[PDB]
């Protein structure tokens, strides 16, 4: 007769009436994003999203969330990447990320495209998701840097990558975290995130408040004393060190 909320460390949650065994299983379960507003509502089995329809959390009454479904028939499914498949729906954007960031030419010289804030946000705000194919450290470290522009370590066993041609938004836009440029003085960090479509991945989270249209940057965190890093970063590293 009551409702349970189960929060991940990143601030997302699953919410609904649990079954007889205390599992998040039913037709009225929701994943709620860290804004505590954007939600994916519908059929889940033991916390796995089978069919989540885009919704807005409008209020809570006695702990029970009340949603309004968005128009458009945007539905989402648990769809963890593999070593060879980045997504079943590469062009279907994440609806939380789409309100928060956009891609445009970087303000940094020769740095290509960058990721920018759509609206002003506070500190500790999840802005973007870093999904990609899941490959080994051995594959990555034994190939040339020119193939490793977008690799991000997830844990000791797994590196997430967005390989060509999925580095172009015309071919892949389900997530956008691989579009954040590097800065030794960043406004964002990488953090763990448990995503209802992508599974266990990393996200980009603000360090401090950020203005609308401010470029989001992260410290790429390459080992400076193995620098095991691409050339543009090695150059930049020296410049940085000098300004210190």
């Amino acid at each position: 007769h009551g409702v349970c909320w189960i929060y991940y460390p990143d601030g997302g949650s699953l919410v609904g009436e649990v079954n007889e065994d205390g599992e998040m299983t039913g037709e009225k379960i929701a994943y709620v994003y860290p804004d505590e507003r954007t939600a994916l509502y519908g059929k889940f089995i033991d916390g796995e999203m089978i069919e989540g329809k885009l919704a807005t959390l409008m209020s809570t009454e006695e702990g029970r969330p009340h949603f309004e479904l968005m128009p458009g028939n945007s539905v989402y499914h648990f769809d963890k990447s593999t070593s060879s498949c980045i997504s079943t729906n590469a062009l279907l954007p994440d609806p939380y990320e789409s309100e928060r960031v956009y891609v445009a030419e970087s303000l940094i010289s020769s740095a290509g495209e960058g990721l920018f804030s759509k609206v002003a946000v506070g500190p500790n705000t999840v802005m973007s998701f870093y999904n990609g194919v899941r490959i080994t450290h051995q594959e990555v470290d034994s190939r040339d840097w020119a193939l490793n522009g977008n690799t991000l370590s997830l844990d000791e066993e797994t590196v997430i990558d967005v390989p060509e041609p999925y580095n172009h938004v015309s071919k892949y836009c389900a997530s956008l975290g691989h579009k954040a440029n590097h800065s030794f003085t960043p406004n964002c960090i990488f953090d763990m995130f448990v995503h209802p479509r992508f599974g266990p991945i990393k996200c980009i989270r603000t360090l401090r408040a950020v203005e609308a249209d401010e470029e989001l940057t992260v410290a790429y965190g390459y080992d400076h004393s193995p620098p095991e890093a691409p050339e543009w970063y090695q150059v930049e590293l020296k410049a940085f060190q000098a300004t210190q």
Partner: peptide
């Protein structure tokens, strides 16, 4: 390692 954030 040739990846971000290890």
């Amino acid at each position: 390692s040739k990846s971000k954030d290890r």
